[PDB]
Amino acid sequence: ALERTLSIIKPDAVAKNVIGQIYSRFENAGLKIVAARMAHLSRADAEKFYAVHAERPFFKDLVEFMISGPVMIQVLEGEDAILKNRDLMGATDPKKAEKGTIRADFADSIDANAVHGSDAPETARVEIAFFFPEMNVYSR
Amino acid sequence: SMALERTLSIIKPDAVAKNVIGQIYSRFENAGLKIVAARMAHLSRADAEKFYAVHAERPFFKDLVEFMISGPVMIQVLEGEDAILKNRDLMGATDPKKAEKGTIRADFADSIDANAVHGSDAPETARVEIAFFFPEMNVYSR
Ligand SMILES: Nc1ncnc2c1ncn2[C@H]1C[C@H](O)[C@@H](COP(=O)(O)O)O1
Numbered sequence: 304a305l306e307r308t309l310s311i312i313k314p315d316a317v318a319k320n321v322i323g324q325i326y327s328r329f330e331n332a333g334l335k336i337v338a339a340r341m342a343h344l345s346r347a348d349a350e351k352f353y354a355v356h357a358e359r360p361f362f363k364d365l366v367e368f369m370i371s372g373p374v375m376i377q378v379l380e381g382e383d384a385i386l387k388n389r390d391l392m393g394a395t396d397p398k399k400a401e402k403g404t405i406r407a408d409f410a411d412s413i414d415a416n417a418v419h420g421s422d423a424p425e426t427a428r429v430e431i432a433f434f435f436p437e438m439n440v441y442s443r
Numbered sequence: 444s445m446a447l448e449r450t451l452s453i454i455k456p457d458a459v460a461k462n463v464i465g466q467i468y469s470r471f472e473n474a475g476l477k478i479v480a481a482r483m484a485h486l487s488r489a490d491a492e493k494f495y496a497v498h499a500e501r502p503f504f505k506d507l508v509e510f511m512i513s514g515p516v517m518i519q520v521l522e523g524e525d526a527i528l529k530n531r532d533l534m535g536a537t538d539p540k541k542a543e544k545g546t547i548r549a550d551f552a553d554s555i556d557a558n559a560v561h562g563s564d565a566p567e568t569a570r571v572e573i574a575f576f577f578p579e580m581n582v583y584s585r
């Protein structure tokens with residue numbers, strides 16, 4: 304159960320003051336919050352984070368929405384963490400997300416879709432390393 | 444209407460281990476307080492000692508320090524109307540035995556040593572405790 308994934312509670316969900324409810328989704332599902340911080344990303348950092356989408360027409364929108372306000376960033380650890388977090392988040396478009404997922408419950412739109420989660424083992428590694436030094440990640 | 448205040452909150456290692464960070468956060472957020480800074484940390488002995496200096500000559504001091512450093516904690520700044528007192532009412536009495544039902548300490552604390560949470564007790568300690576753990580550039584009022 305040492306797999307880790309990178310989660311972000313996006314500015315829309317922070318602004319709703321539902322950080323705790325989203326955290327409980329993780330915790331109740333058996334994931335442990337092993338690193339965490341509130342931050343306000345710069346444009347340059349949002350651009351780096353979303354680099355893989357630099358050529359897509361929704362790039363500017365991913366970026367603008369991620370820097371519109373503070374975010375809560377955390378590392379989630381546990382068995383099958385990457386896929387479990389994805390299951391908890393639900394579909395990218397909240398209109399398509401299953402009932403009781405984070406996006407179905409807290410997302411207003413595909414832009415304001417509440418949360419990010421790493422999509423694969425290598426993106427989890429890169430994203431965790433982007434936001435946290437290992438000395439500030441506390442496995443337990 | 445009262446003064447918008449910031450206070451310093453810590454979810455102690457007992458409650459982090461319980462995986463009830465979310466539940467405690469929702470206590471704050473449902474009471475109309477906003478999380479305006481946060482980070483997970485593992486305090487050093489020295490940092491815990493500094494933080495608890497007001498209790499340095501007391502006999503529970505060593506225990507306060509060893510318990511604060513026994514595992515990672517979740518630290519946050521809470522902002523809202525009357526935040527200092529509000530947080531304290533939500534936490535409940537220092538001794539979970541004495542804490543009203545529905546408080547954080549009643550629901551998540553196992554004892555006076557393992558008592559789940561800290562909150563600043565006054566405006567001046569709030570100021571000092573926030574500055575101890577966060578630079579202002581990482582506190583984001585909204
Ligand atoms: N208009 C208004 N609304 C809400 N909160 C306010 C206002 N003016 C100051 N403050 C804040 C600043 C302090 O935390 C507290 C008392 O002000 P202090 O001067 O520090 O004793 O209230």
Ligand SMILES: [Cl-]
Binds near residue numbers: 418419420
């Ligand atoms: Cl995303």
Ligand SMILES: [Cl-]
Binds near residue numbers: 562
């Ligand atoms: Cl304390």
